[PDB]
Amino acid sequence: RNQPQYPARAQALRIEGQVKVKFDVTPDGRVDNVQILSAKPANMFEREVKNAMRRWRYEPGKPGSGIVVNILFKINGT
Amino acid sequence: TITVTAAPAPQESAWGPAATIAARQSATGTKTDTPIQKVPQSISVVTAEEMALHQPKSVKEALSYTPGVSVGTRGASNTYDHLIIRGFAAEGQSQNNYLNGLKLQGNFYNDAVIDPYMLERAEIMRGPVSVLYGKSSPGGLLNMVSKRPTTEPLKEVQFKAGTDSLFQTGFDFSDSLDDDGVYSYRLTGLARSANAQQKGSEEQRYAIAPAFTWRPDDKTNFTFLSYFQNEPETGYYGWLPKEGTVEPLPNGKRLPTDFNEGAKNNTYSRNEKMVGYSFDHEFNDTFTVRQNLRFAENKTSQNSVYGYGVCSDPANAYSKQCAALAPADKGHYLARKYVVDDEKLQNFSVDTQLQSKFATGDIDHTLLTGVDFMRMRNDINAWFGYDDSVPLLNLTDFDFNAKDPANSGPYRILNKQKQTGVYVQDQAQWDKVLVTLGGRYDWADQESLNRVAGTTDKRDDKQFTWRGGVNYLFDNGVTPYFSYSESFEPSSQVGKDGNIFAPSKGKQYEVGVKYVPEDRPIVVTGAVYNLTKTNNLMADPEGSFFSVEGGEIRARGVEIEAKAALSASVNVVGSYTYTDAEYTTDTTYKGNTPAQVPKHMASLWADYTFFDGPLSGLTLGTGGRYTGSSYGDPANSFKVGSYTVVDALVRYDLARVGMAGSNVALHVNNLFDREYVASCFNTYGCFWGAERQVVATATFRF
């Protein structure tokens, strides 16, 4: 389970937000049915997450539909 | 249910995309990945992000908010990306443009252009540059980096529909073919159709930019960059007399902005195809090698009938057709000549560099050493018409295969250009100070065959050009500096002796400060300079049809730009330009300012995005571009007026509806449909500015 890359624009304006993803699992480890529930702030991390849930991979043959993650992007602080 | 969490630690590329609209690192001023502040000379970087916000139909309309650059030399025509940087241009309505670090050498009419949709970033480097690129106009040079492959997927198709029957369809796809992300690719293409602001003239373009990238390890890259663009029609490119544009006509009315002194069957085609690679290899913390190559064949066909000013013009004094009408008429009657032309040209160019970073005392070094080779050839088969070349016109087709030896002649020329140069540059930084020092020797051989005369004049040049500068690095950002830069460009014209003139020279001193913080993505830059071209050819005092060297022009002034991501909802771009240009040593125009270069230029634009509440996603932009008055000819006879136009933006982010990225927006150029004249290069060569132009677009980043 890899981690989503911090969006440039954000990585630049020292800003942050959280993202609620809901998705499925294709019978082989991969993923499918990519969806974005809530994501404050708006257009900023979306695409960044979708692209990160691309190389994901775990248990082949034991899929499941409808599973939420919810990920938050953060900046050092100092 | 579960949860994940992310972190920081930055780094942008000079050849990659910029984090925001405020580029932080360029490389087209030192040929090294370098933060803008550390560059001893003036620079500018129009980001793709920025461009794809005005939806410019060309790189010229993309430089509208850039200082020391008039994008109105030909007004509303986009046949060429012809720029005048700091009152200077190449010679012979030729352009000084580079792509991915290599010059796109043109000639006569054969000049190629790259659509901006294929560009990743458009940089402008003002001031002399022979120190790094060889021959060129003093103060002036356009370098555009092409979009390159990207690690993450990219699937985007774009639809543009606008005024004057504009229809565009483009697509930009890029991705990684393997798991370990080594073999990547990118395919960019588009098809555009539209009527030229004028009448009877349309413009269609189809271009595909295929690019491949190989990265065996992490200290090596190899990117194939090809580009093929075909245009069956390039649009209007004629001339209108001030007698009907700047100044009114005898009847009192002026010609409409969509007028066209051309013939229903004028045609202008241009086909360009090019292929090359950008190689880069890091051997270790000290040695790194690069290499940019490229070869390209381009063609340009044309059957045009332009308009030489009205009949009462000093230009038409020896005109029969004109001079045979009641003097009352002469004022509202336009002369006209024509041109038929088939051109083809090839251009090869490689540049092997060797970057070497090393120590010494407390000073670090970034030493560059390279060999630049360039060769080009353009074969011309043109035919021209004079004075009584074509029927008059008050204020219809045209037999182009007429070729009447009574008022028409042949122009069959074969030009050869070649240039090898060597150079070294040291970017020395002593803790707080940065001294950039470099030099380059160039061997510029040229040869011209006058097929319709057996006449063949040629020449070889040996020129040394160097540069020096200093940058003080206040650890808060702000960077003050000053630099001395040299330039030189050979002449293609012949003298009374029968030999091509000596290369003209360009010297320039500049002083300024650049603010490039760390906290925010901002880039404020101001500068004051004094640029002077010497040995500029001027007329023969002993009354002759030949010109004479030993002239001089001066460009002096200041310019300030600022681009920045103020908040996360505010973006602001702006500048001011002050150009004082004047003939210092001229045989007939002393004390006069060169035509088309304005004294004052200003630009300001900002957009605001809504993130909360109903309007969440909406983005609203607006801006303005001011252009000062200018002289319409060397004689500084009449003057073209000053104009201010406004642009506007409305863009909704479809992410509020399941589609992040993808949006739909309205772009408006020249909101109040101002009716203006961009400029005139002479009493008889004027150009109308673009009329209001609306473009509605749909971007889908699937």
Second CATH level (architecture) for the domain B154-702: Beta Barrel (2.40)
CA atoms of B192 and B198, how far apart (whole Å): 17
| C-alpha distances out from residue B348 to B130, B203, B679, Å | 19, 29, 35
CA atoms of B471 and B480, how far apart (whole Å): 6
Contact B380, B449 (CB under 8 A): no
CA atoms of B550 and B530, how far apart (whole Å): 19
The b/e string for B38-71 (b: 16+ C-beta within 10 A; e otherwise) is bbbbbbbbbbbbbbbbbbbbbbbbbbbbbbbbbb
DSSP helix/strand/coil, B48: helix
Q: Where are the beta strands (DSSP E) in B540-676?
A: 547-564, 570-585, 600-609, 619-627, 630-631, 639-640, 643-653, 663-669
| C-alpha distances out from residue B280 to B33, B296, B352, B536, Å | 12, 21, 10, 39
Best residue in B4, B13, B612, B616 for a mutation probing chain A (most A CBs within 10 Å): B4
DSSP-derived secondary structure for B67-107: TTEES-TTTT--SS---EESS---SSS---EEETTEE---B
CA atoms of B50 and B647, how far apart (whole Å): 14
Q: Give the minimum alpha-carbon distance from A29 to chain B in angstroms, rounded to a whole number.
A: 15
Any CB–CB contact under 8 A between A38 and chain B?
no
Asked if A13 lies within 8 A of B521 by C-beta distance, the reply is: yes
For chain B, the domains span 1-153, 154-702
State the sign of the Cα–Cα–Cα–Cα dihedral A60, A64, A66, A71: negative
Residues of chain A contacting B612 with CB distance shorter than 8 Å: 41
Closest CA to B55 of B168, B219, B152: B168
Contact B486, B128 (CB under 8 A): yes
Q: What is the CA radius of gyration of chain B?
A: 26
Contact B647, B596 (CB under 8 A): no
What residue has token string 């308009």?
B307
Reading the block at residue B230, the tokens are 């075909």
Total number of residues shown for chain B: 702
What residue has token string 């290899």?
B281
What φ, ψ does residue B176 adopt, rounded to 5°?
-110, 125
Residues of chain B contacting A67 with CB distance shorter than 8 Å: 1
Asked if A67 lies within 8 A of B1 by C-beta distance, the reply is: yes
Contact A45, A19 (CB under 8 A): yes
Resolution (A): 3.3
Nearest to B655 among A1, A6, A43 (CB): A43
Amino acid occupying residue B72? G
What residue has token string 């690129």?
B133
Alpha helices in B456-498 (DSSP H): none
Q: Give the minimum alpha-carbon distance from A46 to chain B in angstroms, rounded to a whole number.
A: 6
Q: Give the minimum alpha-carbon distance from B174 to chain A in angstroms, rounded to a whole number.
A: 13
Residues of chain B contacting A17 with CB distance shorter than 8 Å: none
DSSP helix/strand/coil, B484: strand
Contact A10, A42 (CB under 8 A): no
CA atoms of B520 and B651, how far apart (whole Å): 25
CA atoms of B479 and B513, how far apart (whole Å): 5
How many C-beta atoms lie closer than 10 Å to residue B591's C-beta? 9
Residue B514: exposure state from Cβ atoms within 10 A (0-12, 13-18, ≥19): buried
Among the CATH numbers 3.10.180.10, 2.170.130.10, 1.10.540.10, 3.40.50.300, which is that of B1-153? 2.170.130.10
Closest CA to B136 of B367, B317, B313, B374: B374
| C-alpha distances out from residue B322 to B247, B327, B389, B397, B404, Å | 20, 10, 11, 20, 18
How many C-beta atoms lie closer than 10 Å to residue B451's C-beta? 15
* Pairing mode of beta strands B97-99, B142-146: parallel
Amino acid occupying residue B15? W
CA atoms of B115 and B125, how far apart (whole Å): 19
CA atoms of B112 and B118, how far apart (whole Å): 14
How many C-beta atoms lie closer than 10 Å to residue B549's C-beta? 16
B307 annotated to bind ligand: yes
B406 annotated to bind ligand: no
CA atoms of B487 and B201, how far apart (whole Å): 39
The dihedral region occupied by B44, where left means phi > 0, alpha psi between -120 and 50, and beta the remainder, is beta
**Experimental determination technique:** X-ray
Closest CA to B470 of B462, B461, B479, B478: B479
For chain A, the domains span 1-78
Contact B595, B102 (CB under 8 A): no
The b/e string for B389-407 (b: 16+ C-beta within 10 A; e otherwise) is bbebbebeebebeeeeeeb
CA atoms of B444 and B449, how far apart (whole Å): 17
Query: In chain B, what is the straight-line distance between the N-terminal and C-terminal CA atoms, in Å?
Result: 28
| Cis before B634 (ω within 30) | no
Any CB–CB contact under 8 A between A76 and chain B?
yes
Q: What is the CA radius of gyration of chain A?
A: 14
What φ, ψ does residue B105 adopt, rounded to 5°?
-50, 125
Query: Which residue in chain B has the smallest CA separation from A8?
Result: B19
How many C-beta atoms lie closer than 10 Å to residue B593's C-beta? 21
Contact B608, B569 (CB under 8 A): yes
Residues of chain A contacting B19 with CB distance shorter than 8 Å: 8-9, 11-12
How many C-beta atoms lie closer than 10 Å to residue B366's C-beta? 20
Any CB–CB contact under 8 A between A33 and chain B?
no
Residue B262 per-residue DSSP state: S
How many C-beta atoms lie closer than 10 Å to residue B614's C-beta? 8
| C-alpha distances out from residue B550 to A46, B134, B499, Å | 62, 22, 15
How many C-beta atoms lie closer than 10 Å to residue B558's C-beta? 18
How many C-beta atoms lie closer than 10 Å to residue B359's C-beta? 9
| C-alpha distances out from residue B391 to B233, B304, B334, B502, Å | 24, 14, 9, 41
DSSP helix/strand/coil, B38: helix
Asked if A71 lies within 8 A of B661 by C-beta distance, the reply is: no
CATH number corresponding to A1-78? 3.30.2420.10
